[PDB]
């Protein structure tokens with residue numbers, strides 16, 4: 001492999017269509033599995049049409065001679081007269097092609113590349129380019145785990161075979177057999193595999209030497225800067241209360257913010273630091289921010305990974321941020337024998353985190 005580059009899109013929260021649950025776990029777990037295989041992974045949740053189109057265009061552009069690419073989409077799919085389409089979260093009801101991404105157009109652009117390997121996997125709820133196309137239609141079918149999280153049928157079987165040092169086409173055929181044995185998808189057309197692979201190529205194949213090929217190092221630096229998290233900060237308030245702001249990442253466009261009281265003077269009986277007044281573009285609803293647990297924000301991956309007794313806020317639209325992430329830390333405090341709640345607030349700039357750097 002000249003390089004190993006992957007783009008994973010998972011669409012769950014649809015405006016005019018039924019919401020999905022499985023993409024979250026699927027995208028997250030496939031990201032980890034591909035990271036283990038030395039892929040530079042971009043993982044994005046809930047993308048609009050324009051966001052999808054730009055992400056796909058940028059991923060396609062990386063597909064230079066000998067590069068190993070992998071594109072995964074989990075979400076609603078649409079079929080109209082032999083063509084399949086990927087449905088963005090902002091798509092109107094009923095479905096219409098102009099609002100969707102045509103799969104056949106992507107395949108056509110992939111066909112022009114001189115990639116060492118190009119794996120295009122769809123997990124939808126309805127000279128050679130070495131393209132392996134997997135098209136799963138059992139996505140809303142999912143299984144509930146002992147964790148309480150929803151895992152997709154396709155991903156359940158894919159997770160178990162991805163790390164195998166075997167030709168990708170052989171790997172995917174075993175996944176199709178597993179689904180065929182699975183009682184939910186038994187005698188049904190759940191996975192279609194299309195392949196134009198003339199060479200024994202696997203996702204486990206090594207990346208070309210950095211002592212002569214510097215494009216992997218350049219793309220590694222460019223990937224790294226798109227995954228930068230703000231360093232944790234401490235804010236001091238006039239009353240004497242010291243607050244810590246902590247940051248965790250779930251996906252390339254999803255960040256969890258948490259606040260905790262590091263010092264509370266004896267005179268203050270009860271205090272809480274609430275993060276508010278986020279940029280409009282991010283579309284955060286205050287009724288889904290400052291939660292007592294990360295689970296209540298929709299963050300189930302990174303859960304006992306975070307400090308206890310904090311307030312948690314999930315920023316899942318970082319790709320929409322077109323300025324610095326400037327928000328307010330509002331402190332609400334109470335003196336034991338005093339009338340009510342005293343409020344104090346200070347603005348914070350955490351720059352352009354993660355995908356917002358690009």
Ligand SMILES: CO[C@H](c1c(NC(=O)Nc2cnc(-n3nccn3)c(Cl)c2)cnc2cc(Cl)nn12)[C@@H](C)OC
Pocket residue numbers: 004005006007040041042044047050051052054055056058059062222223226252319320355358
């Ligand atoms: C070329 O850039 C890299 C890249 C991708 N680029 C994007 O996703 N671009 C993107 C552009 N615009 C938007 N968008 N925001 C608002 C409106 N449109 C969005 Cl959601 C995404 C996609 N796939 C991979 C895989 C690897 Cl490795 N890198 N890579 C990387 C450095 O990106 C992290």
